[PDB]
PDB file of all heavy atoms in Angstrom:
ATOM      1  N   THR C 193     -37.612  -1.454  -7.881  1.00  0.00           N
ATOM      2  CA  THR C 193     -37.582  -1.429  -9.343  1.00  0.00           C
ATOM      3  C   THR C 193     -38.881  -1.996  -9.910  1.00  0.00           C
ATOM      4  O   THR C 193     -39.488  -1.393 -10.804  1.00  0.00           O
ATOM      5  CB  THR C 193     -36.407  -2.249  -9.914  1.00  0.00           C
ATOM      6  OG1 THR C 193     -36.596  -3.635  -9.611  1.00  0.00           O
ATOM      7  CG2 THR C 193     -35.085  -1.792  -9.339  1.00  0.00           C
ATOM      8  N   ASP C 194     -39.295  -3.147  -9.367  1.00  0.00           N
ATOM      9  CA  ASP C 194     -40.503  -3.844  -9.822  1.00  0.00           C
ATOM     10  C   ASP C 194     -41.777  -3.017  -9.621  1.00  0.00           C
ATOM     11  O   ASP C 194     -42.697  -3.102 -10.442  1.00  0.00           O
ATOM     12  CB  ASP C 194     -40.654  -5.204  -9.118  1.00  0.00           C
ATOM     13  CG  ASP C 194     -39.547  -6.184  -9.477  1.00  0.00           C
ATOM     14  OD1 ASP C 194     -39.289  -6.383 -10.679  1.00  0.00           O
ATOM     15  OD2 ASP C 194     -38.943  -6.766  -8.552  1.00  0.00           O
ATOM     16  N   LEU C 195     -41.824  -2.230  -8.545  1.00  0.00           N
ATOM     17  CA  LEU C 195     -42.928  -1.300  -8.322  1.00  0.00           C
ATOM     18  C   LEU C 195     -42.918  -0.161  -9.344  1.00  0.00           C
ATOM     19  O   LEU C 195     -43.969   0.206  -9.875  1.00  0.00           O
ATOM     20  CB  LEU C 195     -42.880  -0.709  -6.904  1.00  0.00           C
ATOM     21  CG  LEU C 195     -44.186  -0.026  -6.478  1.00  0.00           C
ATOM     22  CD1 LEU C 195     -45.174  -1.046  -5.961  1.00  0.00           C
ATOM     23  CD2 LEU C 195     -43.928   1.045  -5.448  1.00  0.00           C
ATOM     24  N   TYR C 196     -41.730   0.386  -9.609  1.00  0.00           N
ATOM     25  CA  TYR C 196     -41.565   1.489 -10.563  1.00  0.00           C
ATOM     26  C   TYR C 196     -41.933   1.084 -11.993  1.00  0.00           C
ATOM     27  O   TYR C 196     -42.567   1.863 -12.711  1.00  0.00           O
ATOM     28  CB  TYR C 196     -40.126   2.031 -10.519  1.00  0.00           C
ATOM     29  CG  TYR C 196     -39.906   3.326 -11.290  1.00  0.00           C
ATOM     30  CD1 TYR C 196     -40.695   4.450 -11.050  1.00  0.00           C
ATOM     31  CD2 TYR C 196     -38.892   3.434 -12.244  1.00  0.00           C
ATOM     32  CE1 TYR C 196     -40.504   5.631 -11.751  1.00  0.00           C
ATOM     33  CE2 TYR C 196     -38.688   4.613 -12.953  1.00  0.00           C
ATOM     34  CZ  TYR C 196     -39.499   5.709 -12.707  1.00  0.00           C
ATOM     35  OH  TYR C 196     -39.320   6.900 -13.370  1.00  0.00           O
ATOM     36  N   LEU C 197     -41.543  -0.129 -12.391  1.00  0.00           N
ATOM     37  CA  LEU C 197     -41.864  -0.648 -13.725  1.00  0.00           C
ATOM     38  C   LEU C 197     -43.344  -0.998 -13.876  1.00  0.00           C
ATOM     39  O   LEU C 197     -43.971  -0.619 -14.869  1.00  0.00           O
ATOM     40  CB  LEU C 197     -41.009  -1.877 -14.054  1.00  0.00           C
ATOM     41  CG  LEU C 197     -39.502  -1.632 -14.194  1.00  0.00           C
ATOM     42  CD1 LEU C 197     -38.748  -2.953 -14.192  1.00  0.00           C
ATOM     43  CD2 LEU C 197     -39.172  -0.827 -15.447  1.00  0.00           C
ATOM     44  N   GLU C 198     -43.893  -1.715 -12.892  1.00  0.00           N
ATOM     45  CA  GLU C 198     -45.300  -2.147 -12.933  1.00  0.00           C
ATOM     46  C   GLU C 198     -46.279  -0.969 -12.893  1.00  0.00           C
ATOM     47  O   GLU C 198     -47.355  -1.038 -13.496  1.00  0.00           O
ATOM     48  CB  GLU C 198     -45.601  -3.143 -11.800  1.00  0.00           C
ATOM     49  CG  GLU C 198     -46.871  -3.964 -11.984  1.00  0.00           C
ATOM     50  CD  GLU C 198     -48.128  -3.334 -11.409  1.00  0.00           C
ATOM     51  OE1 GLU C 198     -48.053  -2.359 -10.631  1.00  0.00           O
ATOM     52  OE2 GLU C 198     -49.213  -3.835 -11.747  1.00  0.00           O
ATOM     53  N   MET C 199     -45.907   0.101 -12.188  1.00  0.00           N
ATOM     54  CA  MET C 199     -46.678   1.352 -12.206  1.00  0.00           C
ATOM     55  C   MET C 199     -46.565   2.099 -13.540  1.00  0.00           C
ATOM     56  O   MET C 199     -47.534   2.716 -13.986  1.00  0.00           O
ATOM     57  CB  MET C 199     -46.256   2.267 -11.053  1.00  0.00           C
ATOM     58  CG  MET C 199     -46.802   1.819  -9.709  1.00  0.00           C
ATOM     59  SD  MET C 199     -46.369   2.953  -8.384  1.00  0.00           S
ATOM     60  CE  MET C 199     -47.132   2.112  -6.999  1.00  0.00           C
ATOM     61  N   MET C 200     -45.383   2.047 -14.159  1.00  0.00           N
ATOM     62  CA  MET C 200     -45.175   2.610 -15.505  1.00  0.00           C
ATOM     63  C   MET C 200     -45.939   1.850 -16.596  1.00  0.00           C
ATOM     64  O   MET C 200     -46.448   2.470 -17.535  1.00  0.00           O
ATOM     65  CB  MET C 200     -43.679   2.673 -15.858  1.00  0.00           C
ATOM     66  CG  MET C 200     -42.984   3.938 -15.365  1.00  0.00           C
ATOM     67  SD  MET C 200     -41.368   4.207 -16.116  1.00  0.00           S
ATOM     68  CE  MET C 200     -40.531   2.692 -15.653  1.00  0.00           C
ATOM     69  N   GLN C 201     -46.013   0.524 -16.474  1.00  0.00           N
ATOM     70  CA  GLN C 201     -46.798  -0.305 -17.404  1.00  0.00           C
ATOM     71  C   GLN C 201     -48.305  -0.050 -17.274  1.00  0.00           C
ATOM     72  O   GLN C 201     -49.003   0.082 -18.282  1.00  0.00           O
ATOM     73  CB  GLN C 201     -46.505  -1.795 -17.198  1.00  0.00           C
ATOM     74  CG  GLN C 201     -45.121  -2.219 -17.672  1.00  0.00           C
ATOM     75  CD  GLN C 201     -44.902  -3.710 -17.549  1.00  0.00           C
ATOM     76  OE1 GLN C 201     -45.693  -4.507 -18.057  1.00  0.00           O
ATOM     77  NE2 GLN C 201     -43.818  -4.101 -16.883  1.00  0.00           N
TER      78      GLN C 201
END
Side-chain angles (χ1 to χ4, degrees):
Chain C
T193 66
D194 295 309
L195 195 83
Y196 190 54
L197 294 167
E198 198 270 347
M199 284 183 181
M200 274 194 302
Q201 289 184 54

